[PDB]
């Protein structure tokens, strides 16, 4: 047994007799360079034999005759294999390859006879941010250390003061917020809408429900403000004058903009 059961080369050499074929088959059907992932070709050759076929069988094929293929591994973490020939095939070349392969297997047989057609090793290559959470502030009524006197009125005596700034500050925030929005609006109406008599309601209801249905929404009257701001920061072309209801807007003439957007 120990001397002859190791004569199971037929059960592995036959793998080389057909693999290339299906490989060639894929090669002759795939114009993408026929990249191979064993998770598909392995079931294919399995069906081609109906036997259990695992990557170890390809590893034994590599062990017996390592030059007939490339066995590199994909960057995703999968080991692939392609053909060394620079054209498809000449079936006589394939026949001679199978012949020299079985001859190599017989050389292995002789020079070995212990060794049960072991496997070769693989040729391995060498290889806070404004997350607005608040997980602590909700802990408990920790706010118990400061046992101050009526000094709190002191703080409050300044509170109203900041209420003047704070409010106005919030106001400037829109002077800020709306600002960034209009940075795209002079490319919203511009880049698509060259109808000259455009009104206000239509253009607004276009702005809302435009890309402002994505991550960053906006409201209607806010769109009206955006329009008023665009006109004011560019009265050269954009001329808006109201008739009875709704301010009709001008006839577009496509300037360059950021040169004035810097005036935030």
């Amino acid at each position: 047994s120990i001397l002859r059961l190791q004569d199971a080369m037929k059960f592995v050499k036959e793998l080389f007799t057909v693999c290339e074929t299906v490989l060639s088959l894929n090669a002759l059907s795939r114009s993408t360079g026929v990249p191979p992932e064993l998770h598909v070709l392995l079931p294919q050759i399995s069906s081609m034999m109906k036997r259990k076929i695992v990557q170890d069988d390809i590893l034994k094929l590599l062990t017996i005759w390592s030059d007939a293929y490339v066995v590199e591994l994909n960057s995703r973490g999968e080991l692939t294999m392609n053909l060394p020939k620079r054209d498809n095939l000449t079936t006589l070349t394939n026949k001679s390859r199978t012949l020299a392969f079985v001859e190599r297997a017989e050389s292995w047989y002789q020079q070995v006879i212990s060794s049960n057609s072991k496997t070769v090793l693989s040729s391995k290559v060498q290889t806070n941010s404004r997350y607005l959470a608040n997980s602590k502030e909700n802990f408990m009524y920790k706010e118990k250390m400061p046992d101050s006197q009526a000094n709190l009125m002191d703080r409050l005596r300044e509170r109203e003061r900041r209420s003047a700034a704070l409010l106005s500050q919030r106001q400037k925030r829109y002077q800020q917020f709306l600002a960034m929005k209009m940075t795209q609006v002079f490319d919203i109406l511009f880049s698509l809408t060259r109808g000259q008599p455009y009104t206000e309601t239509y253009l607004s209801s276009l702005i809302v429900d435009s890309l402002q249905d994505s991550n960053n929404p906006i409201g209607t009257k806010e769109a009206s403000e955006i329009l008023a701001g665009l006109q004011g920061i560019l009265p050269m072309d954009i001329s808006v004058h109201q008739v009875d209801g709704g301010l009709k807007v001008y006839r577009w003439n496509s300037l360059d903009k950021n040169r004035f957007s810097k005036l935030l």
Binding site: P35, R170, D187, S191, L192, S210, N215, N216, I218, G219
Partner: protein, 544 residues
């Protein structure tokens, strides 16, 4: 000049995707970007390349992009041909392809259009359309360029069809003869691309409340096929071509014919090249949002009493009900719906279900939410039917086959689908909901089609108690008139009462009056009904 116009378009466009389109480097992606797109494409079999439109605008001050947009269909073959001159150089995919086809699909357009904005003036132009799909059609292979074989010369002709009628050469280009006998079509040497036709309809946000939503039919070609799914909101992008329909006769009348031949009857149909269907991700949503608006959120989230500032600012008109308003604010902010171990998946959504005595302003909450919650739907229920509510089966003449109607539930995906008067809805329709409550997905086996569509939809309710108003005398058991399950699946419950008082009814009356006194619209809550939307669209992403 139009020849050299298209040729200048070619030069400019080849130049654009030639040099870098993205300035970023060392922090984002490499300078040259569409070269990298081509490289990615060459290894695989993408068969099409997407390019930004903003960059096109940023190429030649928009002039190039403007020209591409205004008149587009004239340039589709022009630009598709210009693309080869590039790709032949860098990636030799095309000779190894043995095929020469690339759907140059645009995306990220600056100005979406509601579907009723579609005119004929926009013919042949490029445009983006928001909407809701419905009744997809099965994909069918469509011929693009065919090989006609001469009847006697038997020569090959690379004849191009234009989705109009069988085209055909006139003289056999084989100069051996100039015959006119019908060149024999071939299917083998004929590259055909399958396309799927979906009926898109206008959504609710843009239609004025009270008007029937117009629709249309759009066609998806190339790899864009199968990307649609009944119910999914989409923002298609592509051409606005017209297809001839011989089926238009009679009532219009005057329509002309091609006589100095037969009447050319036409109908509009968008043809979309690219589809987008979306609707720890703060890594995405935040940096996606510009630094400015970060300040606005920063404010509306760093304030201490937001959770209170919010809840008393969800029903500006309604008076009080700080219980229910809370129940709604939590509705629009779903759970996590994260699946379990590969075993099963569990629901992550909330279903508040008000039940109130008369004049409790329970329909106001709905006819508000459905106007403030994104992608929502309001159905009186008793007028509707169970089949309509979950999914409909209907026949289509395209392939003579049965298919799906999205319905309220599927087109209400990822949004609140409010309802009225459950009690009035006979059980025959109460039943059709259950699977859209806990199992979260509908499953249908009718007329041969077996399918299952996931409906991740919050629901609601406003049914009235059995006797209109319910006896305080009686208990609650024999008082709701609804079975155990649908009584359980509602992960809230609000039996709203209505009782007499003075220090309440005076306030309520003053409030309603102030409402009817338009001038006294002091109703301004802290947070507008708009900044609440953006604040949500942020908070929807935490999955604690």
């Amino acid at each position: 000049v139009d020849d050299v116009t298209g040729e200048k378009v070619r030069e400019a466009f080849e130049q654009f995707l030639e040099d870098f389109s993205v300035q970023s480097t060392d922090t984002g992606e490499v300078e040259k970007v569409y070269r990298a797109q081509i490289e990615f494409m060459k290894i695989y079999d993408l068969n099409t390349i997407y390019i930004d439109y903003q960059h096109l605008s940023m190429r030649e001050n928009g002039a190039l992009a403007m020209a591409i947009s205004e008149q587009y269909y004239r340039f589709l073959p022009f630009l598709q041909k210009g693309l080869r001159r590039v790709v032949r150089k860098y990636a030799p995919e095309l000779l190894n392809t043995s095929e020469r086809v690339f759907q140059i699909s645009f995306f990220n357009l600056p100005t979406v259009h509601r579907i009723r904005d579609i005119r004929s003036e926009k013919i042949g132009s490029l445009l983006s359309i928001s909407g809701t799909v419905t009744r997809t059609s099965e994909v069918r292979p469509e011929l693009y360029k065919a090989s006609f074989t001469c009847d006697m010369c038997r020569a090959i002709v690379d004849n191009v069809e234009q989705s109009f009628k069988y085209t055909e050469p006139t003289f056999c280009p084989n100069p051996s003869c100039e015959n006119r006998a019908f060149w024999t079509l071939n299917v083998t040497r004929s590259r055909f691309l399958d396309w799927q036709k979906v009926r898109i309809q206008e959504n609710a946000n843009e239609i004025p409340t009270g008007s029937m939503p117009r629709t249309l039919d759009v066609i998806l070609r190339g790899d864009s096929v199968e990307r649609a799914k009944p119910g999914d909101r989409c923002k298609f992008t592509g051409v606005e071509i017209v297809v001839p329909d011989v089926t238009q006769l009679g009532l219009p009348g005057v329509k002309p014919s091609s006589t100095l031949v037969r009447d050319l009857t036409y109908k509009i149909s968008f043809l979309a090249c690219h589809v987008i269907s979306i609707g720890r991700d703060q890594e995405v949503f935040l940096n996606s949002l510009s630094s400015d608006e970060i300040n606005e959120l920063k404010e509306m989230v760093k304030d201490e009493h937001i959770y209170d500032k919010l809840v008393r600012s969800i029903a500006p008109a309604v008076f009080g009900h700080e219980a229910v308003k809370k129940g709604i604010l939590l509705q629009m902010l779903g759970g996590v719906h994260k699946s379990t171990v590969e075993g099963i998946k569990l629901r992550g959504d909330i279903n508040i279900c008000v039940v109130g005595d008369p004049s409790t302003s329970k329909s106001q909450f709905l006819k508000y939410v459905v106007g403030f919650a994104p992608r929502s739907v309001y159905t009186s229920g008793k007028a509707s039917s169970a089949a309509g509510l979950t999914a409909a089966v209907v026949r289509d003449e395209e392939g003579g086959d049965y298919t799906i109607e999205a319905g309220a539930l599927m087109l209400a995906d990822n949004g609140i689908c409010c309802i009225d008067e459950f009690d009035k809805m006979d059980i025959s329709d109460q039943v059709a909901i259950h699977e859209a409550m806990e199992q979260q997905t509908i499953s249908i086996a009718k007329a041969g089609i077996h399918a299952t569509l996931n409906a991740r939809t919050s629901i609601l309710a406003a049914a009235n108690p059995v006797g209109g108003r319910y006896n305080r005398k009686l208990s609650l058991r024999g008082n709701l008139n609804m079975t155990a399950p649908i009584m359980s699946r509602f992960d809230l419950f609000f039996v709203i009462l209505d009782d007499c008082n003075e220090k309440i009814d005076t306030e309520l009356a003053s409030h309603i009056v102030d409402l009817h006194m338009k001038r006294d619209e002091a109703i301004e809550p802290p947070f507008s009904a708009e900044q609440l939307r953006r604040y949500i669209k942020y908070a929807r992403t935490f999955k604690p």
